[PDB]
Design a protein around this ligand. Structure first.
Ligand SMILES: [Cl-]
Ligand SMILES: [Cl-]
Ligand SMILES: [Fe+3]
Ligand SMILES: [Fe+3]
Lengths: 193, 194
């Protein structure tokens, strides 16, 4: 069956249109999660190259970055019982669940250190959550299945791989964090023939 | 070590330029300055997107804007290869990178196609322009008979998807969609590997 890359091309174009109306963070997340919902509902477009689990670390595959680094679209792929560290973003983010099962535990900086702010959010294909400095920026995403891999498409208000942000230890101390990317090549979504 | 930052900085600068909603005259003038800065140094283009094919000239997409405002393409000619006579129907900038190639501009006359001028002889660093306004029809071809030739083309669209035309000797249009030779683009956005 032929890969429907047009889905990703159309998402990027729509998200470009959105950010050229110079909107506020409240409106970007509200309309953005609608567009990301439309993308991750169908699992027939992500090239197999950017769905591959590594057995040592979770993989971060860049799919597209805006010319002006306004935004970026990244495929995160967790192998069985893998996890991100506790981390912030320092920009608006949208996590769209695509394949498998993973949980997102939100965190807050308290006196004692890190305190989990709420119950682990349980994501199934199609579900879209948000993160930002304004609404709650610290979390930990991890694969719920112990045998299957899990994939989600993340969208950020920057080139997320180059952002100077932080991971957090139990006592609540920051360490500098630049995530980078797992791929040396992006997919060509622009050949409409 | 590949200086991909050069291409990242060009794309960002060209993004800034087009968000000031400038006229075609100003885009070409400031654009050819930025493209000049890129193609003067030949230490950034990944080898994967510099490969000649022995049958047809290769068109490798390096970057496309989110809104399809512009695209940056590596064109690679093998020995004694050539494009057909073609138009663009958008503003274009051809930056010469490696080897030697000539660009013969054309005009549609009564008899058909007549070459409008002498073949423009491009050497590494040289930047020319094309558009409907200033002269849209040309033919780019490798001047060397043994070396390959490469130039970085920048267009005011996603050039591979534009419905444009090739031209035959008698001057008759055939529809033309060029597409791209590559299934993968280079990742110019991982700054943490420097
Ligand atoms: Cl506390
Ligand atoms: Cl003409
Ligand atoms: Fe995150
Ligand atoms: Fe051309």
């Amino acid at each position: 069956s032929p890969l429907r890359l047009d889905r990703l091309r159309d998402f990027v174009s729509a998200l470009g249109e959105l950010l050229d109306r110079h909107p506020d963070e409240e409106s970007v997340l509200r309309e953005g999660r609608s567009l990301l919902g439309e993308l991750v509902r169908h699992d027939d477009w992500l090239p197999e190259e950017f769905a591959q689990p590594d057995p040592e670390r979770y993989q971060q595959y860049l799919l597209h970055a805006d010319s002006r680094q306004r935004f970026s679209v990244v495929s995160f792929v967790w192998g069985p019982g893998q996890t991100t560290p506790v981390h912030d973003h320092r920009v608006w983010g949208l996590i769209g669940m695509l394949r498998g099962a993973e949980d997102a535990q939100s965190f807050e900086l308290g006196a004692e250190g890190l305190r989990p702010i709420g119950d682990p959010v349980r994501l199934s294909p199609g579900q879209v959550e948000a993160v930002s400095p304004r609404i709650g920026d610290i979390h930990r995403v991890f694969n719920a299945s112990p045998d299957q891999p899990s994939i989600s498409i993340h969208v950020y208000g920057a080139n997320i791989g180059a952002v100077r942000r932080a991971v957090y230890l139990p006592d609540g101390s920051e360490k500098p964090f630049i995530s980078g990317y797992s791929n040396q090549f992006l997919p060509n979504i622009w050949d409409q023939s």
